[PDB]
Design an enzyme around this catalytic site. Structure first.
Site, PDB file in Angstrom:
ATOM      1  CE  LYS A 130       6.518  -6.332   3.260  1.00  0.00           C
ATOM      2  NZ  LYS A 130       5.452  -5.789   4.159  1.00  0.00           N
TER       3      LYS A 130
ATOM      4  CE  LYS B 202       1.457  -6.155   0.265  1.00  0.00           C
ATOM      5  NZ  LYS B 202       2.430  -6.020   1.392  1.00  0.00           N
TER       6      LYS B 202
ATOM      7  N   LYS C  22      -4.061  -4.136  15.404  1.00  0.00           N
ATOM      8  CA  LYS C  22      -3.659  -3.044  14.508  1.00  0.00           C
ATOM      9  C   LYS C  22      -4.513  -1.793  14.737  1.00  0.00           C
TER      10      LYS C  22
ATOM     11  N   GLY D 233       0.778  -1.222   0.000  1.00  0.00           N
ATOM     12  CA  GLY D 233       0.000   0.000   0.000  1.00  0.00           C
ATOM     13  C   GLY D 233       0.819   1.286   0.000  1.00  0.00           C
ATOM     14  CG  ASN D 234       3.540   1.957   3.010  1.00  0.00           C
ATOM     15  OD1 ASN D 234       2.465   2.345   3.479  1.00  0.00           O
ATOM     16  ND2 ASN D 234       4.374   1.167   3.686  1.00  0.00           N
TER      17      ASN D 234
END
Lengths: 291, 291
Positions: free
Chosen positions: A253, A191, A124, A8-9
């Protein structure tokens, strides 16, 4: 076959530039479709969903009676907001190469189990830093584990055709199953996990996680600092034991990359940067992860 | 095979109730999938896209520096906002009947020609009634004619499978083609036209337009007032000559219904209400339109 996940960044702060930023990944995605690869495409939505969710709060409720937009619905909008920009760009890039293929964007609902530990520990932080319709303010939201997806069956088939399919936008909308009934809930899904579950269901070879590093390092800013080139689950497990990785940034990740290659000698996972991702697919950059 | 188009006013004012309203159409859609029909699903977005677009303006820009969200992008969000609610509900309803089928929601970009007369006459008023980033304030926006769609090829195939496909959300995002390059533009596309073009490409039999009337009337609040049951293009053309129909409300639906059945003895178009739509499919209600 290759599943690629775009942070997203990397999509920016505003539509203006999101339309700009998205060109880069798309051109890269186009080029693989040429080398004969099947590219399944995915993306995160941290900033975009936040921008949209704030906004309905930010002032809109302030400066009127504008409706209550739970986080699920702002993820719905985030997907169609982003899917739009990706759908043009990747279609566009494929045409520069005079290739003929249908680019698709499936709105994504991700199945999670309702007993997921994650809910009982709302992890979060999200939305307005105030001190907000009744959730667990601290606000905050869980990060459930992705078990599957509303149309995977049909999605994998489109991938069987030569359709370049965009899925798992922002990790999909958290959806539980209660008495054979679906129920979108509030919260997020990482994600990388999401796209790794998808990477598995379509059973691609490679899972590439795009991120702002040339290599994942161990012992950073220490004498024994080292860049990982190849590596495996066994070692990652130790590295993880000694907290080698930023909880959030790299850890998820890594873990998601492990979950995909684990017990599959025929598949790898690449954690490389955007500029250097074609290199990365040839050992020349980034960190390859294996069973 | 049956293409159904659900008006934006039928989806309500807020997520809260949109989640409620959407159940009704879904249950109806479920039941046809049982009678052996293929139901391609579509929907408008007048209110939803407006709510989202205002909001980014409404106060969010007022009460901060929140980004500039053109109308295209708010249509992108409108699709994922609505597609989410539909995707649950219709999936949910199909499960009550213990049917197994993948419900899909394709983010939709609608191809229009850039020389469309509509642009040169910015028709449909939009957003803040003020007196706003540089468009033709009066604001206002065109209503182009839909020539096709980014993934129709792939979409029709999913329909060939038994996949219940949701497309043409809010009529799709207006997209022109310039030098083999796509470019989303600002403006709207009438969802009835859109879904009628789609109805044609998938080549269904019936095109049902859901609307808040039992029949389309001629000569309303006049002595010769009459309800149309069956009818044809020839007559609709005269009725249209004498301005029988609300420019916007009924006219576009009529015209779109004509565009689909025209020169196709094997297909009809039904303009009936939500409550009475199963009746409608059997002459018992609504207005059937034929070549």
């Amino acid at each position: 076959r290759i599943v690629i996940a775009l942070g997203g960044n990397a999509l920016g702060d505003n539509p203006s530039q999101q339309k700009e930023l998205v060109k880069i990944p798309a051109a890269k995605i186009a080029a693989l479709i040429q080398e004969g690869h099947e590219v399944i495409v995915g993306h995160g939505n941290g900033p975009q969903v936040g921008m949209i969710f704030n906004a309905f709060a930010d002032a809109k409720k302030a400066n009127e009676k504008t409706a209550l937009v739970p986080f699920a619905e702002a993820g719905g909008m985030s997907q169609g907001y982003i899917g739009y920009h990706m759908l043009t760009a990747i279609s566009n890039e494929l045409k520069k190469l005079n290739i003929q293929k249908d680019v698709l964007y499936f709105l994504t609902q991700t199945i999670v189990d309702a007993n997921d530990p994650a809910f009982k520990n709302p992890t979060k932080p999200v939305g307005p830093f105030y001190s907000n319709p009744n959730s667990v303010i601290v606000k905050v939201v869980a990060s459930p584990i992705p078990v599957d997806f509303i149309g995977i069956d049909a999605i994998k088939q489109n991938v069987n055709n030569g359709c370049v399919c965009i899925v798992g936008g922002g990790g999909g909308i958290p959806t539980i199953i209660q008495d054979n009934q679906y129920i979108g809930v509030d919260g997020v899904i990482d994600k990388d996990f999401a796209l790794a579950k998808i990477a598995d269901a379509v059973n691609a070879d490679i899972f590439v996680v795009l991120t702002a590093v040339d290599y994942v390092y161990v012992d950073f800013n220490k004498p024994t600092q080292k860049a990982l080139k190849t590596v495996d689950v066994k070692a990652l497990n130790n590295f993880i034991n000694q907290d080698q990785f930023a909880k959030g940034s790299m850890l998820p990740k890594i873990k998601a990359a492990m979950g995909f290659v684990n017990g599959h000698p025929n598949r790898s996972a690449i954690i490389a940067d955007l500029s250097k991702v074609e290199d990365a697919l040839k050992g020349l950059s980034g960190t390859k992860i294996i069973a």
